[PDB]
Design an enzyme around this catalytic site. Sequence first.
Site: not given
Lengths: 334, 337
Positions: A157, A185
């Site tokens: 990410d 997440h």
Amino acid sequence: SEAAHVLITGAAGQIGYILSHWIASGELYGDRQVYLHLLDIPPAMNRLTALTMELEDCAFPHLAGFVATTDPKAAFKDIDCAFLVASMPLKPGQVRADLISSNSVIFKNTGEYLSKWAKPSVKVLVIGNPDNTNCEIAMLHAKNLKPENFSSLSMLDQNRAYYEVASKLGVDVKDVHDIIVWGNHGESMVADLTQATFTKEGKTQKVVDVLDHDYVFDTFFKKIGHRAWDILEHRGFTSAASPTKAAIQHMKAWLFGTAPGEVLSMGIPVPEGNPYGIKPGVVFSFPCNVDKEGKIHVVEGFKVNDWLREKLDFTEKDLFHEKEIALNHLAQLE
Amino acid sequence: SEAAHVLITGAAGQIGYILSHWIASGELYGDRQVYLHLLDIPPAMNRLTALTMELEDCAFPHLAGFVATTDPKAAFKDIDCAFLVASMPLKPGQVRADLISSNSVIFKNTGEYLSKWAKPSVKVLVIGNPDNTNCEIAMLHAKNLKPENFSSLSMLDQNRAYYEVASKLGVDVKDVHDIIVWGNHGESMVADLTQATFTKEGKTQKVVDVLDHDYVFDTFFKKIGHRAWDILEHRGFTSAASPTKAAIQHMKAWLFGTAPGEVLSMGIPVPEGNPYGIKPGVVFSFPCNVDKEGKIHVVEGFKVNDWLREKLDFTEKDLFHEKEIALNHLAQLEHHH
């Protein structure tokens, strides 16, 4: 030197395929040889055999050997590090609570295998979804291990965010700094640009002072939030090379330390007394560095404005809730 | 330094997927940046877009940029090296002559693109099969380039052979030496153990003085000759990570030189002065090293016994025959026009 023993779960899958070769090429442990432990489930044994054949066919000088097995003891015995890639997928009609629950059993068992058979110094990197919670559960059920043995992968990410922001600004990735991915997440992940700076034409500026508010606090997170889906739509399959790159990057940093000035988002057991007001008891992505002894530290000195405070509080609450779902599921089974 | 421009054809396939990431990670050109030209056909462009999204999502410091394209000029313009992975597959019912034929057209076209648009210094590594003949055809049709610009990949077969022999001898691959793959791919490939030595417990011996004749001159080639088929059997798809490893290995050696004592099998245009009795006019795998200037040299001093002489002569004959098939196909198409 004696070979480093490296476990990869779900080894027959797309990530396992690339990860095993990349590690066997010498990229993770430097000059030291690696002995791969490749674990998957019974129906995957032919694909696992195929993987071993290609590894052999590379004549890798760093590859001391391998185990390729469905047996947990053989997979976990005396390992130095682990890439926990495998997890239970969401089945049709299931919701996130089910995903957390089904995986809680797997990761309890994995924690038990680690404690029983791995070296006490094992470095366990949790990748399979839901990773933060899977990591917490494995750690809680690894009696002879400690929080230092566990982390989860948030670097994919981070890397996604750096390329997006750099492209938006029309600069190189090397010229953007201090983008951070915090928390869990999923929906509550915090892709934080409030620290971030970039250089151009001899000026260093804050990203948030140059890019539109609508981009920073709406369009940007949607892009990051739908990136994996977009790739699946184009590729026919989920990402593999890019999470592998991030996984090796995280583990290599964890083994030898980070470079001067480098800030890597990493999911870690929350340290008591962290400077960002996060409660101990979950695994939470923080801006980190790693010292030369391979110990992870939360980077100090970042600022928490009102927006970030609220985002952090929300993802914290989310993590404690996921943990409660997992532990309640396990308790009901007991 | 300006970024090195690297072409990968068939870029949306599994080899292209791994190769592009490996190169972007810095493994080929070291501290130098790379700019990837990624060529494939229109139906593959969504998969190619997916590839580039993953490259982006790695935030590679060595990746200066890339272009994903179906256009030859965009793909070949000012490139420094090329991995020619794409080829035409065998169609149902076809035999090798047809495979050579269908690919002759592709590689004629590719040689023309290279000559027109690539740098004069371009290093072209031909991987797609039949690679020796595809390489010869591309070279013959690259008017502004030279034999030194072209080679074909035989290192996958060499690597297979090293692992197999090392495992048979119960040593590490580093302790085996001078295994060579000579000639063509296909049935005529020569997996030569007659030069090879190994060190075990401080004793160095010739491999053929220790292993059984039946192993060396039957079982061994059977394993090496069928290995591709066996991975497809288990994998459901052809090899990808292992030829990629060999490809990077070959190109990195070609660019920057080989290590002391290192001998890499490489398909090259036959040098007129070669010491092994091979006729110029085809691309033939030889034991090679590469100097620091990136020039490939056939390694001198290996011995050609009666067995090896016969094998070399047979694979030589095979290569000239494949070339004749390819040139005749091209000629027949031209005639029909």
